Ligand code: NA
Ligand code: NA
Ligand SMILES: [Zn+2]
């Protein structure tokens with residue numbers, strides 16, 4: 062890792078992919094690490110999720126420019142929560158183009174939040190100067206609109222919050238979750254990206270495809286015992 | 289370190305940059321060392337901060353002309369306090385051009401002090417006959433208008449009074465400080481100039497990037513202890 066600041070560190074996964082961790086103290090939850098990705102191709106960058114606010118977003122974007130020598134032109138949020146679009150306000154003024162699940166866009170509009178401008182209902186390939194970022198909506202999970210982003214040339218999947226890290230033992234915040242569709246969505250995620258070398262969750266350390274089974278055990282054990 | 293007078297000493301940091309220490313007895317504070325920098329390129333010089341009064345500023349300008357064989361043409365103050373612009377009246381009758389944060393100019397007019405002529409709002413590169421002097425405003429700290437000056441070709445950062453030296457243990461004069469912004473401004477300075485070799489504070493010895501972490505520690509411990 063490389064600590065760019067007091068609350069943000071970055072890890073390179075591949076020559077074009079970096080994963081960041083942004084830390085924020087949130088009342089009722091504590092010190093929460095929120096993860097995103099930085100994808101770079103030919104001096105252009107895509108941000109997958111923003112840190113919780115514009116301030117941390119602006120610091121992260123300034124680092125990509127100055128230390129990674131790329132300009133952020135594209136953004137995709139995993140779902141409508143703050144650890145995904147908390148800093149979208151800052152990117153929109155800057156002219157960054159955003160793509161997201163039409164369900165995320167409808168939720169943001171309803172709630173008074175910044176709204177991504179390009180929507181998709183099932184899948185969409187976004188090109189970062191030829192490098193493909195493949196966005197899929199495979200069903201509900203941690204949030205009803207949560208998506209995944211597959212980077213076929215790198216074999217990296219950003220699973221987002223529908224996946225729990227290996228140190229996590231609880232289902233967590235399920236106030237916008239579709240608990241009954243969650244296990245099914247994970248099974249579709251498992252069948253569709255068997256070759257992922259790295260799988261990055263919404264919070265916690267990245268890992269490999271075991272994070273999918275690990276999450277499925279947590280969701281299923283909870284469904285079994287609360288039922 | 290070489291004394292050019294009983295109360296002024298100079299240290300050469302590179303073939304183009306010198307930092308000076310000017311000592312003055314300030315009633316109620318005692319014998320205070322105030323630092324500034326002299327940057328020279330092709331017989332032209334820029335002064336970053338002046339001594340506390342006109343007589344010491346004159347002694348220093350004479351030394352640059354007679355020993356450095358350079359003409360002082362440019363001036364940039366770190367903020368509006370006397371240890372930054374105390375000798376500006378002398379420089380202005382001499383035709384030196386001044387560049388400063390627009391907030392410093394606004395404060396100078398309001399406080400009946402000499403007023404710099406060129407203002408900038410977020411950043412400005414002043415070219416000293418070809419050599420760039422990069423000025424930035426990254427938020428409030430010791431003063432609400434304090435800036436930093438970055439010399440990319442020498443990897444030297446003049447941080448000014450928003451930084452405390454390594455022998456300093458107290459937050460000092462916070463009468464015009466923005467204590468809540470200070471720790472965040474420091475993280476921004478740190479993130480932007482990771483290649484800084486020398487870091488010069490407004491008072492005390494210069495050192496490296498540890499001055500930034502040490503000042504952030506002093507500020508954070510004061511906020512924590514006084515809430
Ligand atoms: Na995130
Ligand atoms: Na000074
Ligand atoms: Zn969420």
Ligand SMILES: [Zn+2]
Nearest residue numbers: 144222263264
């Ligand atoms: Zn989350």
Ligand SMILES: [Zn+2]
Nearest residue numbers: 367369431449
């Ligand atoms: Zn001051």
Ligand SMILES: [Zn+2]
Nearest residue numbers: 369371449490
């Ligand atoms: Zn000072």
